């Protein structure tokens, strides 16, 4: 049969292959054949799971430990989950620095979606009074999401210079500052 | 001789060729041969001016009417120059929507550099008292730059739905809000 070849296990092995190749080879130069070769699979197996290497990369980001951790973020585990999330990206420094340098828009889009939702969910915990209309919640959630991605991409692009805890505090600062803006529109 | 082939005129004609092709063909599918063909030039002429099509695209953004307008932005012409800048991008909707959809990180990087500098220059006009240290000026200039790019890329990606004047007001809002944050760090 084709049970194992069509399994989630194989699909995860393919993402793992990509991450391994990115340690020796620029993402732009990576081909499907390279991926199936290092994974010990055939081409038909690859195209069962993914349409192309950008679909695979998108899936890899979405199913990475950073993203799994981020979905379950509450206010109670925020400090711990964000820090853990950044450390996980750094543990895979080569893969991230490679793929982001090739096309940062893919990770940026993914991380912005997540931080946007995070902030909209946050409004619902702290604004039961609906003092902030939907237009302004959306505006500031997006602003927050742009900042989070800007900080993340920059950190990765420049080679993970700052400590993860330092980046974690910057992301919090953006959260603290955005909430403050969202509740200070009629300041004048 | 090769005077005209090596001129700024030819270089501008090449960027113009790219923008024309982007109206009929996805940027990913555009090759050098397509560019030299529509420009009526040869390959050796292209590589005199550019290393590749991404170098050309980067140059095209940098030398576009939006960027020329933006360099000369003061506070006195801000309202007028920003609006004009956005209208110019919309006048070239097909080219921008095409290339940004292919790789938004190129335009994002370009526009973030510009808005960052704009904001740092702004600090020098309004903070002679140096109440804001360099670390915090940089932090908020970057935050501002991330927002400006996020707004621009989104507007382009979604097909230029909002009026240019509406986007112009959002960018101003980000400027007004960032300055306010930069002067409200010890709020508690």
């Amino acid at each position: 049969s084709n049970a194992m070849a069509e399994s989630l296990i194989t699909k995860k092995a393919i993402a793992g292959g990509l991450m391994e190749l990115c340690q020796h080879k620029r993402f732009e130069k990576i081909s499907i054949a390279d991926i199936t070769n290092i994974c010990g699979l055939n081409r038909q197996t690859f195209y069962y799971h993914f349409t192309d290497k950008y679909d695979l990369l998108t899936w890899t980001y979405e199913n990475d430990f950073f993203h799994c951790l981020a979905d379950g973020i509450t206010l109670g585990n925020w400090d711990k989950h964000v820090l853990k999330m950044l450390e996980s990206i750094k543990e895979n420094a080569d893969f991230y620095k490679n793929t982001v340098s090739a096309d940062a828009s893919i990770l940026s889009f993914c991380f912005s979606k997540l931080t946007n939702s995070l902030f909209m969910d946050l409004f619902e915990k702290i604004d039961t009074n609906a003092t902030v209309n939907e237009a302004d919640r959306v505006f500031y959630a997006e602003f927050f999401s742009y900042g989070c991605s800007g900080v993340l991409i920059k950190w990765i692009t420049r080679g993970f210079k700052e400590a993860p805890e330092t980046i974690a505090n910057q992301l919090f600062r953006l959260a603290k500052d955005t909430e403050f803006l969202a509740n200070s529109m009629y300041r004048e």
Side-chain angles (χ1 to χ4, degrees), chain A:
Chain A
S1 72
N2 295 314
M4 181 56 95
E6 299 172 6
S7 72
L8 175 64
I9 289 173
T10 293
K11 191 172 192 180
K12 287 188 177 188
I14 293 172
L18 174 60
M19 300 178 98
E20 232 251 284
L21 291 172
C22 289
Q23 187 178 149
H24 311 296
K25 193 169 182 174
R26 294 168 75 253
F27 178 75
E28 303 98 308
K29 292 304 179 66
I30 292 181
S31 172
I32 277 74
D34 295 81
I35 291 170
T36 58
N37 276 3
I38 199 177
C39 294
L41 308 169
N42 54 38
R43 284 191 184 162
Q44 34 174 182
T45 294
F46 180 90
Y47 290 108
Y48 179 91
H49 296 292
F50 307 104
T51 70
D52 51 80
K53 78 174 182 180
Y54 297 89
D55 189 33
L56 163 66
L57 176 62
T58 301
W59 191 87
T60 302
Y61 287 154
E62 290 173 358
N63 290 85
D64 201 38
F65 196 28
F66 101 84
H67 185 103
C68 288
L69 277 174
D71 293 329
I73 287 181
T74 77
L75 284 184
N77 62 23
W78 177 284
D79 291 308
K80 207 181 177 181
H81 265 49
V82 171
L83 188 267
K84 198 166 304 173
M85 183 180 73
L86 299 169
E87 286 173 334
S88 168
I89 300 183
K90 183 181 176 186
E91 274 291 279
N92 269 273
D94 293 336
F95 166 73
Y96 278 97
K97 194 180 174 196
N98 189 335
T99 58
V100 168
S101 298
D103 193 345
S105 67
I106 303 176
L107 181 65
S108 182
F109 173 80
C110 174
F111 199 60
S112 298
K113 255 200 61 185
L114 188 140
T115 53
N116 187 315
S117 295
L118 240 55
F119 206 79
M120 294 296 286
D121 288 345
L122 185 55
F123 268 123
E124 294 178 341
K125 290 286 178 178
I126 74 169
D127 192 31
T128 309
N129 240 318
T131 90
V132 196
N133 63 45
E134 197 67 11
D136 297 329
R137 287 192 180 187
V138 166
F139 181 82
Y140 288 121
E142 289 174 349
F143 190 18
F144 172 74
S145 77
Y146 300 147
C148 288
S149 280
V151 166
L152 185 63
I153 297 307
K154 182 204 178 195
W155 185 51
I156 292 171
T157 288
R158 294 200 328 163
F160 302 91
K161 313 215 83 173
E162 301 89 333
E165 17 272 310
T166 302
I167 302 298
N169 199 77
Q170 291 180 11
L171 294 177
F172 163 72
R173 236 235 261 199
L174 297 178
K176 170 183 168 178
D177 288 355
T178 309
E179 188 279 326
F180 175 67
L181 278 179
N183 288 91
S184 294
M185 268 171 302
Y186 338 102
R187 41 185 167 271
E188 48 131 330

